[PDB]
């Protein structure tokens, strides 16, 4: 699995479950093309978005629907979403974990990139 996303809740100290996200890849015409989508599991993780063969070099965007997560808990959060945009596989294939740690008025995000 070359691309995995993990989302955590900093208020309750838990995985952020059932968080929707969409992944896009930048095309030759510089537009954003849909690439994959899914929702986080009970562990806060979303696996199985792509394969090594499909996940070619390019600029990718992960848009995480953090607002709907908070709204379902009764909270009106600051951010409309959390977007993570990055170039992938520019030096050959790598495995990417994108993590996001959520609070109502803040988020952190980090990438763990490993060589298979």
């Amino acid at each position: 699995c070359p691309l995995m996303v993990k989302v955590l809740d900093a208020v309750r100290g838990s995985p952020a479950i059932n968080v929707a996200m969409h992944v896009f890849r930048k095309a030759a015409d510089d537009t954003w093309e849909p690439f994959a989508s899914g929702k986080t599991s009970e562990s806060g993780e979303l696996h199985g978005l792509t394969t090594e063969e499909e996940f070619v070099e390019g600029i990718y965007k992960v848009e995480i629907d953090t607002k709907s997560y908070w709204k379902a808990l009764g909270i009106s959060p600051f951010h409309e979403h959390a977007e993570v945009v990055f170039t992938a596989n520019d030096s050959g294939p790598r495995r990417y974990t994108i993590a996001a740690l959520l609070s109502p008025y803040s988020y952190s995000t980090t990438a763990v990139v490993t060589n298979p």
Copy 2:
């Protein structure tokens, strides 16, 4: 001043100076409309982006050019940029400080929202 952005560097322990950013407002057709731009000062801050009369309710986006910042320091970055998207003034005008704490493979962002 209703909108200020502050950027810090977690590698050097310093303000992030000369970081460029652009601010957009969401248009009726879901496109991003130019609104303001600037670069951070020696204190890591960008002031004077808008006025209280111009800064009406709506969805706003701040795109911070973190990649150029790290490249100018000779450090390899992960992200293409750091985007912050939020709805402003939905409960009356507020003063917004958007802060971003930058590392090459991670960033944090938070909002400090105060009522004058």
Copy 3:
């Protein structure tokens, strides 16, 4: 003012007001010696802890009473406190801002160190 502490609340999107903290200097026998204390202002800041002549080289600890902060807001916290330990002035006097961004189950801390 060579040492300032700023505390922010990631749940409310606000300065963390009335947060108590104590500062210690490490003694020759490896024990922590009282140095200063205070509580954050309406801007989340605590100034005036020491003077340039008193703030000599050494190892310092700031213990921030985050648990009492969250309890006073009726929110369950994870940590007993947030401690920041650092060596000061090892390359000449600097001005230190210690910042902490608080959530109930997470915190971030960073230092902004500038040379006058």
Copy 4:
């Protein structure tokens, strides 16, 4: 495994490997008693610190030797270490993951607490 620690490097986007840490438990006399120790693996994780039977209610401290990690990379970091202090198992047994995300002048820490 009721207590696990994970350490990540925000500069390189990688696990922080071979990071030493010591865990302490507060005794009846309010002193810190050694509880466990270890170093992070190639995945940045330290498992096997304790058992459900031994990991009784109490206040625990994890002291992560972040300074030695940075110094081995040639870097003089801000913090002497990163300490995480928390009450555990006050409402019955739980499983704790303590994570720390490291930069030279900043760290973040969060807890994921689950019910077995």
